[PDB]
Paper text:
NXF1 is a modular protein comprised of four domains: an N-terminal RNA recognition motif (RRM), a leucine-rich repeat (LRR), a nuclear transport factor 2-like domain (NTF2L) and an ubiquitin-associated (UBA) domain. NXT1/p15 is a 15-kDa protein that also has an NTF2-like fold and which forms a heterodimer with NXF1 via the NTF2L domain. To do this, type-D retroviruses have a ∼130 nucleotide long RNA element known as the constitutive transport element (CTE) in the 3′ end of their single-stranded RNA genome that binds to NXF1:NXT1 without the need for adapter proteins.
We present here the crystal structure of the complex formed between Homo sapiens NXF1 from which the N-terminal 95 residues and the UBA domain had been removed (NXF1ΔNΔUBA) and NXT1 and show that it has a novel homodimeric domain-swapped configuration generated by a interaction between the linker between the LRR and NTF2L domains with NXT1. Density for the RRM domain was not observed, probably as a result of its not having a well-defined position as a consequence of the flexibility of the RRM–LRR linker. Hydrophobic contacts also dominated this interaction interface, where Ile360, Phe362 and Val364 were buried in a cavity of the non-canonical copy of NXT1. The resultant domain-swapped dimer generates a flat platform with 2-fold symmetry in which the three pairs of RNA-binding domains (RRM, LRR and NTF2L domains) are all arranged on one face that results in their being ideally placed to interact with a dimeric binding motif such as that found in the CTE.
Residue numbers in the entry:
A (entry chain C): 202 to 424, 427 to 549
B (entry chain A): 203 to 423, 427 to 549
C (entry chain D), D (entry chain B): 3 to 140
The structure:
Amino acid sequence: NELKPEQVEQLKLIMSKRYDGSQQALDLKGLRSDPDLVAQNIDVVLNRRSCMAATLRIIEENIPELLSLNLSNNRLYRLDDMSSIVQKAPNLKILNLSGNELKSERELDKIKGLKLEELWLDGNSLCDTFRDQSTYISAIRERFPKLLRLDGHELPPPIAFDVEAPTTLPPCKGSYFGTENLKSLVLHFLQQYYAIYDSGDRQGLLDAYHDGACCSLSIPFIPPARSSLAEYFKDSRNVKKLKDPTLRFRLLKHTRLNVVAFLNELPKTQHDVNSFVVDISAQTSTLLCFSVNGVFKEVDGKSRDSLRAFTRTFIAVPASNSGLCIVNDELFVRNASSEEIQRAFA
Amino acid sequence: ELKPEQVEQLKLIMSKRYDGSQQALDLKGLRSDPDLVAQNIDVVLNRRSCMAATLRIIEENIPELLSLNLSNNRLYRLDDMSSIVQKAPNLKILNLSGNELKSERELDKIKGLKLEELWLDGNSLCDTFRDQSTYISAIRERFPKLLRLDGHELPPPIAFDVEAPTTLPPCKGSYFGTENLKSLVLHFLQQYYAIYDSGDRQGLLDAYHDGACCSLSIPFIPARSSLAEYFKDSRNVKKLKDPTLRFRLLKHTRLNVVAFLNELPKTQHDVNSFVVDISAQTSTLLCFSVNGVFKEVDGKSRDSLRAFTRTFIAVPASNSGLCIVNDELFVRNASSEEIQRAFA
Amino acid sequence: SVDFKTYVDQACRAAEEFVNVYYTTMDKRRRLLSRLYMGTATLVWNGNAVSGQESLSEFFEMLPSSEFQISVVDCQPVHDEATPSQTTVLVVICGSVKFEGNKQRDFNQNFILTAQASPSNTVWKIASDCFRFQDWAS
Amino acid sequence: SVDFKTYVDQACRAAEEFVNVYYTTMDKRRRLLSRLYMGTATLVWNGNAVSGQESLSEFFEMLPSSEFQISVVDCQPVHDEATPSQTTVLVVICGSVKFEGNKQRDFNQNFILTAQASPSNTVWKIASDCFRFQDWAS
C-alpha cells in the first residue's frame, strides 16, 4: 500500500547513497532488492504509481541537476506513470530501461518530451519483435531525434538542418541628433515650444508655425466607454478606420490660425522636457524632420490626474534668427505604461 | 447596316480627318460632317452598329494611332465601344467631351486601355462631384496612369516599385572548371559509354568500386508508356514510403550493379551531344552530372529516343582513372527540340 | 493650379497603399524592402542611424523575420517650401510587431514619401524612416 | 560499426527532410537559403559556377522569387572512402519550377550532403549543388 512518511526519508537516504556526485548518476537498479530497504522491511515497488511518483518528487526536490538515471530490472509494464519525468528532471540526458517487461515501442511516446543523448532498451521483450536494426533505430529515433547512443552503440548522425535564422535585435539607443548643432537647435526649440505649450495660453505658438502649417492628432484604437482618451477621442484621425474623404479633410487643420485655434482647445499640459527622447529622421537644406517621444500630465478637469504618453512628429523649414518653422505637426497620444509612469519625474 | 460603299466613304472621311504627324483621329460631330451629309450618309456613333463598324475600321486600317477624339457625338452608353481596348491598344489619348454620359460608372467598361490624357469636360457626370478631389480620385480609379485630365495636369500618380527581379541568368552548356577535369571526365565518359553501348556490359566491372551503389528513376506520371519498362525498376523515395522495399531497388555491390545494368535494354548514346557538369571536386572524391540522349535497339522501346540525366561520384584511380562509388540514372522521353537535334 | 483637398485625398490613398506595400514586403520579401528607400534616405531604428542603400539592405537582412499588425495610420501632405517642385507626403503608423525569437511589441513609426518622376514612369521613394518601440527601455 | 540498410534508411529520411527544408526556404525566405551551403561548396546553375558563401548569397539574391513543385526524388548513401570519417549522402530531385516572369520549366537537380558534428550540436550542410533545366536550349 502507501508508504509511511518515515520510510520516505529512509528511501531518500538510500537514493542519496545510490547517487554519485562526480558523474551525476542516480542508480535505481533493482531498488526492491536493495539491502537497506529490505533490512528496514520497507517494500518499494517502482512499477506502482505511488512509489514512482514519490521517487520523481524526491528527484525534483533533492537533485534537479542530475544528467543520468538507471531504472533497469524494475519490471515496469507501463511507462506513463513516469511521464512527468520531463519536468522533474529536465537536465536528464541519459536513461536506462534495460531488463523490463514492456513489449512495445508505443510506451515511449509518453517519454518523448525529454531529450536524451544516450538510451538503453536492451533486454526488453520489445527488441525481439523487430527484424532489422534499421527499423529499431528509426522507431526509436522518431521519439528521440537527438540521441547519439543506443544500447551502447553509437548511432548515425542525427538528422538536422540549420537554417540559421537571426534572433538578435539591434542595440537600442536613447536619442539621435546627428551633429551637435541639431542637438542644441532642436532641444532649444523644444524648450521654447513646450515652455509656451505648457503655459496655458498657447497663442505664443503662432510665431513657431508656418502660414500653411498642417497639424493632426491620433490615438491607439480602443475596442467609447468614457476611457481616459475620451477627450482626445473627438479629434483623432485614422485613415485606416475612416474612409470618408470630406471628414478626413477637416480632421486635418490647414492653416496656422485653425491649428492654434484647435490647439487651444486641447487640455492644459505638463511635459517632462528632460525625459524627452528625440530622433532626427532626416535633414536637408530645405527641411528638417524629427520625432519626440515622452509623457505628459494634464492640469485641468477630472481627467487631469491621469498621465499620458505621447509621440510627436515635426517637420521644420528654417526661419530667421536661427529659429525653425514647423510646416507639419503630428501628435500620437496614449495612456502611459506603468514603467513610464514610475519614471515619470526625477 | 450601312452599304460597303458608305463604309468606304466613311473610311475616306476618317482618312481625311486623320493626321499623320500627330497620329490623331478626329471624329468630332461625325453626323454633322459636311461630306457624309452631302453623300447622304448618316452615321450615329451612339448606335451600337455604326460604332462597331467605325471601331472595326479603326482596327483594319490604322492600328498605330495614339490619339482619338469622340466629342459632341451624344453617346449615352460606353459599353458598345468597350472593345476599343482590343481595336486600339496603343491609344494613349481619349476625348469624350460634350457628350451625354450621365454617370462615372460608364468608364468601368473602358478601364482596360491606358491613357496619359483624358477629357470628360461638358458631360452630365461632372455635375455630381462636390470637389475636384472626388472627381480626380473617381476618374483615377479607372485610369490610375493618366497624367492629364481635362487639359489640367494632375498630381503624380501613386505607384510603388518593389523592384522584384524577373530575369534569369543566361544558360550555359557545360562546366568542367579546370580543363584537366574536362579531358579526364570526357575520356572517362568515352570509355564508359563505349563499354556501355557494346551489349556485353561485363566490361564495366573494372570501372565501379567494390561497395558501389546504383539506382534508377523516371518522371512521375499509366500503362504501356515508353518508360513503363523502367517503371518496374525506378526508385522514388517520395512516392514509396516503405523502407524494406526501398532497400531492394538499391544495388549495394558492383556485382548487383552490373548484373542490374545487364538487365537494362541495349543502348546507343550520342556522346558528342553530352552535356557535363562538375558539381564538386575534392582530393577524396569528384562528382559530375551527365545530361544527354540515347536510343535503344531491342524490344518495344526499339526505334524510340530517350533523354537522360546521370550523376556520378568518383574516387580517383591510378593513371587518371576514376572509380565510381555512387551512380544515379534518371530516364525520360526526349523533347521534340531534342529529337530534332538528336544526332549529327 | 491644383486644389488643396486633392493633395489630402491623394496623400491618404498614397499612405494606405504604401502601408500595404512596405509592410507586406517587409514581412514576405525582406530582401526587396530595401529597394523602396532612395539612396539619400536615412533610417533611425531605435536611435541607430542607417544611411545609404547598402547599409539599409544589410541592416534589413540582419533583422529577424517579422509579422506586423497595424492598429492605426495617419497621413499629411507636406508644404512645397520644404521640397520645392517635388510632391511629398508624411505618414505615421502605430501598430504591433513580432520579431523572430523576440516577444511582441507595440511600435510607432513615421515615413516621409517623395514622388520621383522619370520620363517612362513615376514612382515614390522613402526619403526618411524613424522606427521606435513604445517600451524600448525594457 | 553500423549496418548498411540503416545508412540507406537514414539517407531516405535525410532526403525527405532536406527537400522540404531547402525548397520551402528557397520559396518563402530566399535570404536564409545560403546558410545551408558550406563555404567550400560549389554550385553549378545551368553551367554557371558559384563558389563561396558570399557569391552564393548574392547569386541567390539576384534570382527571381520561386515556386518549386517537386515531381520525384531519389537518394543514396555515399562510400566512406569519398569522405573519410564523415557521414554523407547523395540526393537527386526532378520537378517543375515557376520563376517570376518566366514560364514554368521542368528541372533536374542533385545535391551532396555532408554531416557536420560540433560538440554542442550536429548539423548537415550541402557540399555541392548542380541545377539544370530539362530545356536549357531555349
